[PDB]
Write a protein that binds this ligand. Structure first.
Ligand code: NAG
Ligand code: NAG
Ligand code: NAG
Ligand code: NAG
Ligand code: NAG
Ligand code: NAG
Ligand code: NAG
Ligand code: NAG
Ligand code: NAG
Ligand code: NAG
Lengths: 24, 50, 549, 99
């Protein structure tokens, strides 16, 4: 229960402390 | 880049606001602080534009 | 007479200036009565405090409210402001009155029927009455007179409105802005407030620094307002410059955590700086061959030098004369020498002249201080001439902190040979213009130059500042040997090398600091700041909102 | 020590006043308030204490005259812009001008 098919998993695996800066 | 610019020291005696304020009196610090404000504002505007 | 409590709801708004504005929404910061402040009702002569300003309202007539007193503890030692409402006019006087608040006899004389004053002559103002009545019960029943009393800077301002209201033993609903009634440029100190009943009740509230959004109509009058500090919804209305907000989520503010307390840490240095050895040396070197002394591992009291008699000048560069006492330094040098006295300006970090160029030069940045004092005595002895002055270096602009005492020949270009005349031999000048106890430039101004290294290195010189303990695991305002900031101090569990004093991250900002007394390593984590947004269904649906941090 | 406020002047220099012109672009000075524009009857209901008015941009819109206490609107003089219409110099040297 996190899948994301086999090909999708490959895609996610391959691609890869602040002063006023945030991330939403 | 945006973060690194904070240490640039844009013509001021120090890149650290606290070091300016802890050393100089009001009428002197304001000048040094304004130099950093201009530089940091310009750096931030550059970031946003990009 | 007894108190009671209520709520202002909308009351206390007034025109902040003298500018006509119509069909606009204007945001202004001034002293206002918070929309829903707790207003104290009093039965109808108690003396209340006066803060930034006072809101006053009552439905009683002028035969009950005869005026007001504003000032400090009332006596002949201080001026008070007396505002009295008469049948036909208003009389306002400022003076060192002990009393002067009677003019109405009944039974109470213990603190009245006395007229002791000084040289009044201060804003003895007379005009039209502040309290106007209505045609009995042909009005709205009990006219509510609203007043705002401000004391800001050279002014005592009064705003008011009569606006008759429906009968109620409370503050009425609806919006009404007060207009300026009078503006008296009185230099008076007001800390207390008292009404004049000469004995039903009145309301008193207090103004606070607030930003209001004022809605003006086509006729230039204020018809509504929003208090920016009331709630997240009002904040949203104000940031959007609108009295109506559409369904959605808005970014209105920025969350902050305050440290509430500070931490100060220094090494246990019990030694004192050898300043006596420098300023009271009694033996000062010539500028030709100045004496360079170093100070370390001691406490530096600079106040004792700055805040001290017998100095002629004390000029600091890169640091304030009143702040250096709270700073840590490394390797402080004290250059001790004597000059002619008209050369004081020639030893500045950026000036030129025979001293700056040949005898003693400073860096262009030079963080430090140049201190000098008369000391005409002892040095400028009659018949005494002891101040070598370096004039000839062949080159110029010697070097910052370089001492050249080579005494070579200044070949004038006349010939590449040795000799005296036409060779300008002997680099220093022996004609010392001492002019014993006479003229100008007669060798006043013994000079001590304090050069400081404002480095990341362990402090060697600290000021007379007392340390505190550590708090840890809390947002605090810290100072470690001059290293200041705000954040949470925690055990770092980092393997610092034996010589390292602090650490930095990839951004090259302070990540951790070594404590100067325990030598433990603490991480510095910034306190939460996040941001604040407000979730609303829209003001045409409900006034309920949710807030996201 | 001077207070350079928008409030009614309490201290004035030894400067002589002139009459009003109205309905013309003029260079005006009202108690130190200066600018260039056309002064006209505002027909605005100023409150008894107001000295001048401003617009949404928070710029001077109208001024009260210190002697007559009448309210005058201040309308910026025309500035527009000027462009030149040409068929090309390889055709003719006649042009039209648009203001
Ligand atoms: C502005 C304000 O603080 N109002 C509160 C009110 O909400 C509360 O109900 C009452 C005590 O019951 O105390 C007042 O001070
Ligand atoms: C009815 C009334 O109070 N008249 C007052 C008088 O009491 C006061 O002494 C005097 C001071 O100038 O001013 C009058 O207007
Ligand atoms: C008690 C009292 O007010 N004494 C006043 C004093 O305040 C004032 O400063 C001085 C003239 O300068 O004349 C005295 O009579
Ligand atoms: C009773 C009292 O607080 N008096 C102070 C006065 O000492 C101070 O000098 C002045 C400000 O200049 O403010 C007044 O409120
Ligand atoms: C926005 C507004 O309230 N306009 C009214 C106007 O309709 C009325 O005619 C006039 C008095 O004649 O007073 C103005 O304040
Ligand atoms: C560091 C030092 O001792 N400075 C002395 C000062 O203590 C003394 O009070 C003063 C008298 O004029 O002369 C200074 O040189
Ligand atoms: C290494 C170190 O500084 N140890 C300090 C000591 O110098 C100081 O005297 C004492 C309190 O009196 O507290 C110790 O932690
Ligand atoms: C769904 C809804 O309530 N819409 C109202 C509309 O009925 C009202 O006439 C208008 C103001 O004139 O404001 C809108 O928000
Ligand atoms: C209210 C006002 O200022 N009226 C002025 C008057 O002061 C002046 O003396 C006169 C010319 O002499 O012109 C009037 O309009
Ligand atoms: C339509 C027309 O007149 N075109 C002319 C061309 O004949 C001339 O040779 C050239 C300059 O060499 O300039 C062009 O504008």
């Amino acid at each position: 229960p996190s899948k994301r098919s086999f090909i999708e998993d490959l895609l996610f695996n391959k691609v890869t402390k602040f002063n006023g800066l945030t991330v939403l | 880049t945006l973060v690194k610019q904070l240490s640039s020291n844009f013509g001021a005696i120090s890149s650290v606001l606290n070091d300016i304020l802890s050393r100089l009196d009001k009428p002197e610090a304001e000048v040094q602080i304004d130099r950093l404000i201009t530089g940091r504002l310009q750096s931030l505007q550059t970031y946003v534009t990009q | 007479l007894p108190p009671a409590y209520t709520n202002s709801f909308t009351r206390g708004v007034y025109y902040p200036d003298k500018v006509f504005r119509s069909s606009v929404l204007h945001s202004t910061q001034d002293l206002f009565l918070p929309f829903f402040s707790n207003v104290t009702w009093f039965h109808a002569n108690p003396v209340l405090p006066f803060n930034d300003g006072v809101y006053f309202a009552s439905t009683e007539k002028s035969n009950i409210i005869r005026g007001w007193i504003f000032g400090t503890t009332l006596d002949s030692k201080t001026q008070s402001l007396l505002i009295v409402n008469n049948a036909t006019n208003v009389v306002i006087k400022v003076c060192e009155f002990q009393f002067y608040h009677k003019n109405n006899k009944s039974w109470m004389e213990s603190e009245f029927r006395v007229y002791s004053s000084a040289n009044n002559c201060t804003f003895e103002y007379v005009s039209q009455p502040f309290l106007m009545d209505l045609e009995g019960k042909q009005g709205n029943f009990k006219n509510l007179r609203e007043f705002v009393f401000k004391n800001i800077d050279g002014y005592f301002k009064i705003y008011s409105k009569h606006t008759p209201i429906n009968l109620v033993r409370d503050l009425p609903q609806g919006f009404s802005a007060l207009e300026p009634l009078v503006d008296l440029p009185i230099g008076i100190n007001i800390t207390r407030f008292q009404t004049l009943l000469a004995l039903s009740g009145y309301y008193v509230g207090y103004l606070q620094p607030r930003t209001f959004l004022l809605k003006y109509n086509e006729n230039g009058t204020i018809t509504d307002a929003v208090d920016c500090a009331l709630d997240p919804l009002s904040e949203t209305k104000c940031t959007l410059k609108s009295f109506t907000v559409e369904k959605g989520i808005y970014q209105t503010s920025n969350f902050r955590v305050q440290p509430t307390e500070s931490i100060v840490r220094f090494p246990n240095i019990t030694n004192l700086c050898p300043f006596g050895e420098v300023f009271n040396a009694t033996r000062f070197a010539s500028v030709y061959a100045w004496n360079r002394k170093r100070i370390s591992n001691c406490v530096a009291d600079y106040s004792v030098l700055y805040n001290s008699a017998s100095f002629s000048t004390f000029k600091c560069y890169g640091v304030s004369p009143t702040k250096l006492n709270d700073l840590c330094f490394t390797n402080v040098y004290a250059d001790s020498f004597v000059i002619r006295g008209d050369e004081v300006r020639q030893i500045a970090p950026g000036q030129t002249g025979k001293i700056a160029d040949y005898n003693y030069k400073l860096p262009d940045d030079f963080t430090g201080c140049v201190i000098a004092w008369n000391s005409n005595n002892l040095d400028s002895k009659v018949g005494g001439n002891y101040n070598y002055l370096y004039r000839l270096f062949r080159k110029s602009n010697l070097k910052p902190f370089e001492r050249d005492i080579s005494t070579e020949i200044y070949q004038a270009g006349s010939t590449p040979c040795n000799g005296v005349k036409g060779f300008n031999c002997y680099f220093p000048l022996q004609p010392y213009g001492f002019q014993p106890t006479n003229g100008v430039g007669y060798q006043p101004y013994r000079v001590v130059v304090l050069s400081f290294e404002l480095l990341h290195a362990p402090a060697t010189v600290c000021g007379p500042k007392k340390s505190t303990n550590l708090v840890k695991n809390k947002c605090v305002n810290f100072n470690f040997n001059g290293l200041t900031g705000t954040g949470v101090l925690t055990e770092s569990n980092k393997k610092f090398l034996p010589f390292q004093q602090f650490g930095r991250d990839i951004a090259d900002t302070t990540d951790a600091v070594r404590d100067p007394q325990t030598l433990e390593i603490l991480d510095i984590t910034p306190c939460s700041f996040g941001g604040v947004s407000v979730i609303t269904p829209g003001t045409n649906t409900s006034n309920q909102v949710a807030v996201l941090y």
